[PDB]
Ligand binder design. Structure first.
Ligand SMILES: c1ccc(-c2ncccn2)nc1
Ligand SMILES: [Zn+2]
Length: 361
């Protein structure tokens, strides 16, 4: 494509940081008061803020009125029960025998109910947003699954609040062959990263005709954040002029491509199933394929970008996009996304690439 064109796109994209940060401030305030009022309840005592997502990864673009926050909650001594070889969805039981468990009320049998937890969560949040008349914050009717609550700050800002269980235990076995960063960020880093906790968000699993509503999906957004904000083989990568790479620029460009394409065909349902996480996952795989900083030279911004696109396209055609942490978990399976959508997105991206990306202007 050429470096300078994409770079112009990146300038135009860079112009929104001030506004996005300004809204992020208000979000921060509201969420702060919320968490302050949430820790009162015995069930959500050890609840806290989890600073992950596009904003904290410094890759959020062109959506200042939309934010996603995650609330983490420490669940000690838990036992995970894998659902139907899905490798990613789990039942949360408790290995702890005493009734000292603060989540006993949400225990539907030996298994911890996600429905009860989410219900109490939404209830407490509703009461606490009703309690405050200082700021103009209102909840929203239930729609999505993983985004538990949806808030509206003033009558402009929109915040998606997600709840996540935190486990300081060692990661599930399905993550064993994942996080292939050995040749990129070193085995040492992979080793110390796996010593960090893992998270679980309430997400129902698709069987085909019905959905299991009492399951939890693995989450490693903190690991994604760490990797993105420390992305080079060199520790001083992007800390001086001679060591400037174009990884994050490529990620931004991909995210922007998908956003613009989703916007152009928004009156249909073809691209509704695709999200930024797909793009990010593909990006991480490309990073694994090209572990050297010299393969991400600034002047090569064009080629690199194409690389990403190319790989993404491949994932579309072969209907295979492995989760970066859970290899046997396929984000692009026919169960999750139908062939027609993938072929449509392939068609569009290929057109764009064949005509110097007119969607970038
Ligand atoms: C954080 C954000 C999104 C996701 C996800 N999005 C779509 C399909 C599967 N996972 N996972 C983690
Ligand atoms: Zn770098």
């Amino acid at each position: 494509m050429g470096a300078s064109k994409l770079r112009a796109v990146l300038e135009k994209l860079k112009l929104s940081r001030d506004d996005i940060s300004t809204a992020a401030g208000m979000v921060k305030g509201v969420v702060d008061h919320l968490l302050l009022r949430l820790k009162c309840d015995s069930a959500f005592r050890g609840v806290g803020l989890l600073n992950t997502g596009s904003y904290y990864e410094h890759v959020k673009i062109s959506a200042p009125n939309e934010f996603d926050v995650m609330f983490k909650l420490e669940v000690p001594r838990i036992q995970l029960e894998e659902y139907s070889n899905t490798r990613a969805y789990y039942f949360v039981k408790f290995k702890r025998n005493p009734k000292e468990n603060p989540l006993s009320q949400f225990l539907e049998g030996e298994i911890l109910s996600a429905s009860k937890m989410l219900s109490k969560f939404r209830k407490i949040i509703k009461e606490e947003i009703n309690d405050i008349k200082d700021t103009d914050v209102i909840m929203k009717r239930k729609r999505g699954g993983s985004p538990a609550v949806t808030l509206l700050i003033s009558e402009k800002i929109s915040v998606d609040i997600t709840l996540a269980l935190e486990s300081k235990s060692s990661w599930p076995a399905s993550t064993q062959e994942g996080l292939r960063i050995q040749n990129w960020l070193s085995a040492k880093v992979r080793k110390q990263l796996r010593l960090k906790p893992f998270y679980l968000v309430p997400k129902h699993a698709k069987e085909g005709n019905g959905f299991q509503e009492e399951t939890w999906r693995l989450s490693f957004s903190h690991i994604e954040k760490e990797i993105l904000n420390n992305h080079g083989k060199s520790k001083t990568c992007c800390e001086n002029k001679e060591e400037k790479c174009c990884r994050k620029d490529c990620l931004k460009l991909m995210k922007y491509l998908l956003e613009q394409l989703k916007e152009r065909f928004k009156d249909k349902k073809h691209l509704d199933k695709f999200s930024s996480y797909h793009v990010k996952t593909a990006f991480f795989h490309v990073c694994t394929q090209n572990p050297q900083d010299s393969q991400w030279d600034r002047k090569d911004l064009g080629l690199c970008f194409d690389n990403c696109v190319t790989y993404f396209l491949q994932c579309l055609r072969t209907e295979k996009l492995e989760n970066y942490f859970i290899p046997e978990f396929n984000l692009f399976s026919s169960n999750l996304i139908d062939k027609r959508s993938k072929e449509f997105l392939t068609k569009q991206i290929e057109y764009e690439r064949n005509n110097e990306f007119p969607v970038f202007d």
